[PDB]
Amino acid sequence: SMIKQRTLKNIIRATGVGLHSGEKVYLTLKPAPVDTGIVFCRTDLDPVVEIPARAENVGETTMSTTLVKGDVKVDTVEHLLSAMAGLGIDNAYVELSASEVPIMDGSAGPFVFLIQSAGLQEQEAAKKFIRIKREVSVEEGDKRAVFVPFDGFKVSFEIDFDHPVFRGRTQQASVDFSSTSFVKEVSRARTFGFMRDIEYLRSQNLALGGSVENAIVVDENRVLNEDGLRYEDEFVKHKILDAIGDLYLLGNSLIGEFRGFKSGHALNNQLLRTLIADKDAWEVVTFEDARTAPISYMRP
Ligand SMILES: C[C@@](CCn1ccc(-c2ccc(-n3nccn3)cc2)cc1=O)(C(=O)NO)S(C)(=O)=O
Ligand SMILES: C[C@@](CCn1ccc(-c2ccc(-n3nccn3)cc2)cc1=O)(C(=O)NO)S(C)(=O)=O
Numbered sequence: 434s435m436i437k438q439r440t441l442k443n444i445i446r447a448t449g450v451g452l453h454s455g456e457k458v459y460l461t462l463k464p465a466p467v468d469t470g471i472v473f474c475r476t477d478l479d480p481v482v483e484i485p486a487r488a489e490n491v492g493e494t495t496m497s498t499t500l501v502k503g504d505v506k507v508d509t510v511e512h513l514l515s516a517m518a519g520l521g522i523d524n525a526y527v528e529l530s531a532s533e534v535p536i537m538d539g540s541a542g543p544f545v546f547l548i549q550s551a552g553l554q555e556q557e558a559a560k561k562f563i564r565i566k567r568e569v570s571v572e573e574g575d576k577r578a579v580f581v582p583f584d585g586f587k588v589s590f591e592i593d594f595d596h597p598v599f600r601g602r603t604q605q606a607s608v609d610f611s612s613t614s615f616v617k618e619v620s621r622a623r624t625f626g627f628m629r630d631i632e633y634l635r636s637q638n639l640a641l642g643g644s645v646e647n648a649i650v651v652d653e654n655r656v657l658n659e660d661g662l663r664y665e666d667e668f669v670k671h672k673i674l675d676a677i678g679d680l681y682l683l684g685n686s687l688i689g690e691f692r693g694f695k696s697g698h699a700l701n702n703q704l705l706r707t708l709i710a711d712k713d714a715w716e717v718v719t720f721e722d723a724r725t726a727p728i729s730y731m732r733p
């Protein structure tokens with residue numbers, strides 16, 4: 434059959450705290466009709482404020498990706514969006530009782546598991562993909578983010594931390610999703626930050642919810658998490674996870690390749706804005722036969 438749009442098969446509920454705000458938050462994911470996209474809804478507000486998870490609604494990009502509308506925000510959307518992108522969810526309502534998505538364990542793992550426990554539902558409309566037709570590159574300072582045409586979906590990233598826990602380690606990684614599992618090899622990679630910064634971050638209402646329970650906390654010369662890392666390259670794999678979530682603000686799955694060098698949320702969003710504006714560089718495609726497409730998805 435054709436590759437169909439997907440939504441949730443059942444309502445998902447989760448509770449947690451915002452990484453940056455520390456606020457308790459209830460998250461509810463609900464099915465949504467064809468061509469809705471992913472839409473966040475601040476249900477603590479009346480009337481609610483609904484913000485489509487789209488590049489045009491990105492306000493702040495300092496320490497997380499934040500959506501804004503009116504006076505209102507939804508902070509830290511990237512890890513949830515990474516899970517929804519990795520599982521191929523097109524349409525969903527994401528209700529939140531506070532201004533920040535819960536951080537869970539710092540990775541996309543818990544969201545992936547909650548979604549896959551609920552199940553996905555195919556819908557009676559073709560899934561639309563954005564295919565990169567021409568290279569699009571943005572740079573600022575020593576940072577670079579690029580889309581290049583590629584028959585599939587592939588994400589590469591390089592970091593360069595002047596820090597003794599990072600020097601001599603694997604700071605580059607490349608994942609081609611024709612051969613590597615998002616679920617197994619990317620989704621579990623946790624966010625990370627530095628003990629040196631915590632008093633300063635908190636003085637700015639950042640990382641107020643952060644701890645070893647939801648982040649890899651790096652001290653001056655060692656990782657503080659007593660149970661260790663999930664991947665030897667967990668840091669760069671988390672940057673790949675972040676990039677997948679930020680890229681999903683295009684609103685559709687990508688057929689193309691992303692390469693990041695010290696990119697973060699701000700440059701990722703600048704890349705999306707430049708791609709969207711360079712309409713010669715992309716097109717929207719659908720697949721009447723899943724067998725012949727360059728990307729394939731797990732059973733729903
Ligand atoms: C079969 C296999 C891999 C399956 N697959 C397929 C697609 C994606 C994927 C993830 C993100 C995006 N995207 N983000 C932003 C925009 N678009 C697009 C596609 C992830 C994945 O995992 C598997 O087993 N998965 O468990 S495989 C044999 O390659 O291991
Ligand atoms: C932007 C980014 C990272 C986001 N982040 C994550 C964790 C912390 C953090 C820092 C210190 C502690 N802590 N100190 C003592 C005890 N606990 C706990 C958590 C700070 C932060 O800013 C990201 O993942 N965005 O999605 S990242 C990897 O791209 O730089």
Ligand SMILES: [Cl-]
Nearest residue numbers: 696697699700
């Ligand atoms: Cl950046």
Ligand SMILES: [Zn+2]
Nearest residue numbers: 511624671675
């Ligand atoms: Zn992150």
Ligand SMILES: [Zn+2]
Nearest residue numbers: 711712713714
């Ligand atoms: Zn052009």
